[PDB]
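fwd from M.: "can u put these together and see what the complex looks like"

so here's what she sent:
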Amino acid sequence: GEIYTETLQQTYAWTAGTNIPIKIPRNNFIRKIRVQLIGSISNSGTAAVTLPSAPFPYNLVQTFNLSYEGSKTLYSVSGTGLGILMYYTTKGQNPAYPAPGTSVPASGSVNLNVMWEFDLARFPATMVQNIILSILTGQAPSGVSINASFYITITYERVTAQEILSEGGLGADGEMPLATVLPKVIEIPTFNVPASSAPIHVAYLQPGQIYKRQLVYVINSTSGINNTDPTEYELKIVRGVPTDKIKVSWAALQAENQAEYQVAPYSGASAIIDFRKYFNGDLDLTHAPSDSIEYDLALQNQDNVYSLYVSYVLPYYDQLAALPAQVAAIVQQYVARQKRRIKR
Amino acid sequence: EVFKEVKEKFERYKFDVVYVDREYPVSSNNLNVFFEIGERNSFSGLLINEGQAVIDVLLLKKSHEGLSPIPGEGTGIQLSAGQILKFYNVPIAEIIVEYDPSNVSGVSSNVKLKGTIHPLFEVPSQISIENFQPTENYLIYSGFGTSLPQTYTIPANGYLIISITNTSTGNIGQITLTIGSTTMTFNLQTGENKIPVIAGTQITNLTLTSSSAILIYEEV
């Protein structure tokens, strides 16, 4: 239909350690919701305070939670998470001031402006209840004070009753169009994966969604996200004949990100693995028994590994599969286009 | 036609039930916490008033509008410290917890919402309050040394108990309390110290002469 974008008049003050619940108006379907922490970081102290390094400024928003009906969760990433995912999908050009380690002039200030972006394909926001994007802000850097607010810019596409019929009308229960592609960008944290030279089991990818890419990054207690422990990553398809879709050295995994994202590594402890490149198309686990694909890590020391997945689910996945080769072809093409809209 | 039929049917129910957990500070700085449960489905679980403040919890049938109680549409239950609001298949469209206009200033509670929204079944909808008054022996501070790291608000009318324990006996310091336009200073001994107080009284200072264990609570 008619995509059209706007900022919501109403902003939200970034306060330290708060959960700021935001209601996202339900006018049409929602294509992408941008949020920006915009203001400045002030130093009122006598000596020039240098800002914490990566993941800052990103971790200023400790966590994100965009969901509908208060329970069905489309998004769950931390600012540090969605922030690095944002850094890659945009060639390290994603808005993030100030850069890590930058100085707030003694009794003066710098500029604050960070962004996040939740891509909802073409989310049927008119047919669901309450899409609430709760930003649980983190902690203000040491020595400096954050004077910013959030700006929610929402992108609607006037999907009409007519057009909706043209892609398979509604679902089995008719709560969304048949060709709905609900983004399911979740991030599951693992703690104390012990140090090893041989990739030791880190965590399983749980079924109920189609995985497009996975952003894994480890966090040392000392260097934060600027460590170099991840040495050998490994995606083992455990179910069926046991196989290694991936067994690349950390360096080589960061290498594919050079070619893939044309951007230097966000840090020594991060990378991204695109499943469309190790399977034919996206790695689907909609019906695969749980514990069918796990991913490993050879950590120099023993740390915490965060794995953010950019996945999406098809709420009528079977009706899409049980559709006549006639209709399925047309419906598949709408779902197909939508599946790629959810990049970042 | 008279029919005698016999059929043993296997049936199962696969209906997705999504859990929910939302804890929002509720105080003079955050008057409204609002949890969105969708009108179409039904929520069952707990709304926990884990705090000292009393909140007015108004569940509405109609979304997009309220912020006050739309009559017939939404019903309101008042909840005090420790009272749980239990839901049994109550189809709500939004739960709005308002920090009560009548609380003693400074008192806050973390209203947490833990339950699951599952489709609305053909069984009754219900509400009730579990744990109606845990007689509260309300705990204010536990720590050690010779002074307090912060000021504290006393939540209710009752008796302030300051228990000071050390390896000795006798006079150990002083406490200062304020309410409104009054200040009071009290002598502290080891063991129990009991002071009648009214809701909202502030503990503004304590100074001890020797390092001690410090326990402050209110018998209400």
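replying to her w this: Chain B touches chain A through 20 residues (CB under 8 Å).
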